[PDB]
């Protein structure tokens, strides 16, 4: 499983300013968390899939 993300440099500046959060870490904090949720869903999904 894999995922990608595309953030512009100027967005990193604006997000670092104004609000005050690093634009880079959020996408890493989103993609990695999202993938783990899907796998954690797939394990649950298979159980109901295979249940009698």
């Amino acid at each position: 499983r894999q995922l990608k993300a595309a953030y512009s440099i100027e967005l990193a500046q604006d997000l670092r300013a104004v609000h005050g959060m690093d634009a880079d870490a959020e996408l890493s904090g989103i993609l990695a968390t999202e993938i783990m949720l899907e796998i954690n869903r797939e394990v649950v999904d298979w159980i109901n899939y295979s249940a009698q």
Binding site: A5, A6, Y7, S8, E10, L11, D14, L15, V18, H19, A23
Partner: protein, 52 residues
């Protein structure tokens, strides 16, 4: 592809104030002296020839 159109700016920074004042000039153009009563009296003493 998160551009800068996704993040919405907050309060714009106030960089500069701009007042408008004339180069007021009356200390140098006239001669001033504080009067201690609501009526100010100047003395004009003139030197006259025998023809006034």
């Amino acid at each position: 592809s998160t551009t800068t159109n996704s993040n919405s700016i907050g309060r714009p920074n106030l960089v500069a104030l701009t007042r408008a004042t004339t180069k007021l000039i009356y200390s140098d153009i006239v001669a001033t002296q504080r009067t201690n009563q609501p009526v100010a009296a100047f003395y004009g003493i003139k030197y006259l020839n025998p023809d006034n």
